[PDB]
Amino acid sequence: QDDSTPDSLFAGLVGEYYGTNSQLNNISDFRALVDSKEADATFEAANISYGRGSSDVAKGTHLQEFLGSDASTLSTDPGDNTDGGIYLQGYVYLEAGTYNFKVTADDGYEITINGNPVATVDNNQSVYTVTHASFTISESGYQAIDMIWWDQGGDYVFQPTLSADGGSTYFVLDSAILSSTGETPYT
Ligand SMILES: OC[C@H]1O[C@@H](O)[C@@H](O)[C@@H](O)[C@@H]1O
Ligand SMILES: [Ca+2]
Ligand SMILES: [Ca+2]
Ligand SMILES: [Ca+2]
Ligand SMILES: [Ca+2]
Ligand SMILES: [Ca+2]
Ligand SMILES: [Ca+2]
Ligand SMILES: [Ca+2]
Ligand SMILES: [Ca+2]
Ligand SMILES: [Ca+2]
């Protein structure tokens, strides 16, 4: 807790959606958009496996389709934009050990854990899956996590899967392990 407002506790990350009619080319562009204004919509990111879809995430009802099971928590239905993306932040329960992300995306993204980037694509791309380098968690518990992802137009997809067993199996980040505040969620 960092201010005088109570924060919703749920088994998910705090999600913000931002749209723009400018071009998003890279992580810096999307982060500047996030910085420039209040979110166009907020939502609870409880099942982080979004898309695939076509014909721009920022148009029509494409954001709702993309977010699927998390769209029922949208604060509003944003108007049309050409480009858009999401900023997620909260906590993820991880035991101490070694992990790595494998992320399928169109366009780019960046995931950080405890302040350190652990999966980065700093450019636009048609759908592509990267197996990222491993990282360590030093102490079991809720780890701080944030993510950004965007769509510059066209197709869109975002599924960042995590392995705890050296890339033999991967899981989606969902309500089993996510927390909005770092307290234990019970529903
Ligand atoms: O050039 C068009 C294509 O550009 C790529 O980088 C992706 O953003 C696609 O979703 C888009 O359709
Ligand atoms: Ca607060
Ligand atoms: Ca903002
Ligand atoms: Ca809309
Ligand atoms: Ca879906
Ligand atoms: Ca739902
Ligand atoms: Ca664009
Ligand atoms: Ca795209
Ligand atoms: Ca392990
Ligand atoms: Ca496997």
Author numbering: 5 to 191
Q: Can you list sentences taken from the study reporting this PDB entry?
A:
MpPA14 (Marinomonas primoryensis PA14 domain) lectin is a domain of a 1.5-MDa adhesin responsible for a symbiotic bacterium-diatom interaction in Antarctica. PA14 domains share a β-sandwich fold and the presence of two consecutive aspartate residues in a cis peptide linkage (DcisD). The DcisD motif coordinates a Ca2+ ion that is directly involved in binding polar vicinal hydroxyl groups of various carbohydrates.
Mannose bound MpPA14 slightly more weakly than glucose. Like glucose, d-mannose bound MpPA14 via the 3,4-diol. In addition, as the C-2 and C-3 hydroxyl groups of mannose are positioned in cis, they may form an intramolecular hydrogen bond that further weakens the 3,4-diol from binding Ca1. Alternatively, β-mannopyranose can bind MpPA14 using a second configuration where its 2,3-diol anchors the saccharide ring in an inverted fashion, allowing the ring oxygen to hydrogen bond with the side chain amide group of the Gln156. However, α-mannopyranose failed to fit into the electron density via this binding mode, which indicates that MpPA14 can only recognize the less prevalent β-anomer in the equilibrium via its 2,3-diol (33% β-mannopyranose as opposed to 62% α-mannopyranose at 30°C). This apparent lack of one distinct stable binding configuration explains the relatively inferior affinity of mannose compared to glucose.
